[PDB]
């Protein structure tokens, strides 16, 4: 019998029974319909095949199950999407991202300095959540003492994307957007008159095919970047480190061999899959991997399910930092492949290498059976992760 599940319900993704439900879907109905008839691609093959057919599986209806499209690149199809992405790509060239290494490392060291003397911290609150916020906030010109405000707006907006909000939460969402809009339009006006090397400056000057980003587009695209920056990577940092601590042979391998870190980051991404789904709207009736789909309905791409697909990943419930190949779909695939992937990987690398070296005897206070995941239908990971370690003095 099929699992009785609602794939638009955030409680499904907070359940540690989700992977059992995905396993059934992959073995019995790869393009699954949930208890409300919502279609979802559960196998790696079905996700890739949909990703590769953007004219049939469109982003232009919006990437959430019951919300309309917003005027931003992730809700656009080519050719318009390609121009928008090329414009925003000025902020994400390989050289610009790699050049952030020293500054990101400094933030990692400041955050570890704040807890290293204590011998205990909440890995989520004190390391995983603040590092990506500080990096993206610095790119956007946010004063350090205002990071919490931007993180609050980001939580409001990602909660809106992660659920079907009440009217009161709709109002909060609109208020947060209005505050972000006000701040960002001030930055745009200032950078136009006195350009710097910050993200808004680089985006203002970007030109492709004789076109530039409008103020409207700058607000929307930088907001997409803010929330990608501050709502996703945190969950790979916490949940990926959790797996290193649960399987101490994996922690020990990384401690003794820094050259294993790139493969470890990939396995942390495969395992944690912070983005649980993105939607595609059907542009025509189609028979897709055994399931009839109707023009105008949305189908979810279940990235965590694909990342645990035994047809692609041998023994997928084994966390193995050495896994090769590791062609996971945490960042998706195709036209919309995460623009921030290099930045996210760099943050994960720099914080993890410092955690391994500076907190070398790190351990979990209590095991996973009592560590909850955030209820959310879109992006999710650990709420809290208390950890202990031998104290050390700060680097300063
Ligand atoms: C581990 C962290 C992250 C994960 C798992 C992640 C995941 C994703 C996924 C699944 C998509 C859609 C791909 C698809 O549907 O095939 C996406 C798109 C995108 N992401 Fe991320 N993301 C992360 C971090 C970031 C960061 C840090 C940024 C920016 C600084 C960012 C910016 C974007 C943008 C702009 C898009 C839209 C690309 C397009 O539509 O062409 N993401 N991301
Ligand atoms: C109601 O007005 C608005 C306006 C803007 C937004 C924010 N749009 C948005 C933000 C974040 C993501 C998640 C994500 C980003 C990058 N990589 C991976 C995941 C998707 C869409 C919401 C509501
Ligand atoms: Br299949
Ligand atoms: Br479009
Ligand atoms: Br920048
Ligand atoms: K505020
Ligand atoms: K397994």
UniProtKB/Swiss-Prot annotation:
Give the species: Mycobacterium tuberculosis (strain ATCC 25618 / H37Rv)
Locate the residues binding heme. Answer: 338
Record EC number:
1.14.15.28
What keywords sit in the KW lines? Cholesterol metabolism, Heme, Iron, Lipid degradation, Lipid metabolism, Metal-binding, Monooxygenase, NADP, Oxidoreductase, Steroid metabolism, Sterol metabolism, Virulence
InterPro entries, A to Z: Cyt_P450, Cyt_P450_B, Cyt_P450_CS, Cyt_P450_sf
Which reactions is this enzyme annotated as catalysing? cholest-4-en-3-one + 6 reduced [2Fe-2S]-[ferredoxin] + 3 O2 + 5 H(+) = (25R)-3-oxocholest-4-en-26-oate + 6 oxidized [2Fe-2S]-[ferredoxin] + 4 H2O; cholest-4-en-3-one + 2 reduced [2Fe-2S]-[ferredoxin] + O2 + 2 H(+) = (25R)-3-oxocholest-4-en-26-ol + 2 oxidized [2Fe-2S]-[ferredoxin] + H2O; (25R)-3-oxocholest-4-en-26-ol + 2 reduced [2Fe-2S]-[ferredoxin] + O2 + 2 H(+) = (25R)-3-oxocholest-4-en-26-al + 2 oxidized [2Fe-2S]-[ferredoxin] + 2 H2O; (25R)-3-oxocholest-4-en-26-al + 2 reduced [2Fe-2S]-[ferredoxin] + O2 + H(+) = (25R)-3-oxocholest-4-en-26-oate + 2 oxidized [2Fe-2S]-[ferredoxin] + H2O
Superkingdom:
Bacteria
User: Which co-factors does it depend on?
Assistant: heme
One example of a Gene Ontology biological process annotation: cholesterol catabolic process
User: Which family does the entry's similarity section mention?
Assistant: Belongs to the cytochrome P450 family.
Example GO molecular function = steroid hydroxylase activity
Its biological purpose is as follows:
Involved in the utilization of cholesterol as the sole carbon and energy source by degrading the side chain during infection. Primarily catalyzes the sequential oxidation of the terminal methyl of cholest-4-en-3-one into (25R)-26-hydroxycholest-4-en-3-one (alcohol), (25R)-26-oxocholest-4-en-3-one (aldehyde), to finally yield the carboxylic acid (25R)-3-oxocholest-4-en-26-oate.
- Show the Pfam families listed in the entry: p450 (PF00067)
Pathway in which this enzyme or protein is active: Steroid metabolism; cholesterol degradation
Q: Which GO terms describe its cellular component?
A: peptidoglycan-based cell wall
Q: Which segments of the protein form a coiled coil according to its record?
A: none
Query: What turns on expression?
Result: By cholesterol.
Protein name in the entry: Steroid C26-monooxygenase
Q: How is its activity regulated?
A: Inhibited by econazole, clotrimazole and miconazole.
């Amino acid at each position: 019998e099929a699992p009785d599940v609602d794939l638009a319900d955030g409680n499904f993704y907070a359940s540690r029974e989700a992977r059992a439900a995905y396993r059934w879907m992959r073995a019995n109905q790869p393009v699954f319909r949930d208890r409300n008839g919502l279609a979802a691609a559960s196998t790696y093959q079905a996700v890739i095949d949909a990703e590769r057919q953007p004219e049939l599986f469109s982003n232009a209806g919006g990437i959430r199950p019951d919300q309309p499209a917003l005027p931003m690149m992730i809700d656009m199809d080519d050719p318009a999407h390609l121009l928008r992405r090329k414009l925003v790509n000025a902020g994400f060239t390989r050289k610009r991202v790699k050049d952030k290494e020293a500054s990101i490392a400094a933030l990692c060291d400041t955050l570890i300095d704040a807890v290293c003397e204590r011998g205990e911290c909440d890995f989520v609150r004190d390391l995983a959540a603040p590092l990506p916020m500080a990096v993206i906030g610095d790119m956007l010109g946010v004063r350090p003492e205002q990071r919490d405000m931007f993180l609050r707006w980001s939580d409001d907006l990602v909660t809106f994307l992660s659920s079907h909000v009440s009217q009161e939460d709709f109002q909060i969402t609109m208020d947060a957007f209005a505050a972000y809009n006000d701040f960002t339009r001030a930055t745009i006006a200032a950078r136009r008159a006195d350009p710097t090397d910050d993200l808004v400056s680089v985006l203002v000057s970007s030109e492709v095919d004789g076109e530039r980003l409008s103020d409207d587009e700058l607000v929307m695209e930088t907001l997409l970047i803010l929330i990608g920056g501050d709502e996703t990577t945190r969950h790979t940092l916490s949940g990926g480190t959790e797996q290193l601590l649960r399987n101490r042979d994996q922690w020990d391998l990384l401690q003794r061999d820094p050259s294993l870190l790139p493969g470890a980051i990939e396995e942390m991404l495969r395992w944690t899959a912070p983005v649980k789904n993105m939607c595609r709207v059907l542009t025509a009736d189609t028979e897709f991997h055994g399931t009839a789909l109707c023009a105008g309905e949305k189908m979810m791409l279940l990235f965590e399910s694909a990342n645990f697909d035994e047809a692609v990943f041998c023994e997928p419930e084994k966390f193995d930092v050495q896994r090769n190949p590791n062609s996971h779909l945490a960042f998706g695939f195709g036209t919309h492949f995460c623009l921030g992937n290099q930045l996210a990987r760099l943050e994960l690398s720099l914080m993890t290498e410092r955690v391994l070296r500076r907190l070398p005897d790190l351990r979990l206070v209590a095991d996973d059976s009592v560590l909850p995941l955030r209820p959310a239908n879109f992006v999710s990971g650990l709420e809290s992760m208390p950890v202990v370690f031998t104290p050390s003095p700060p680097l300063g």
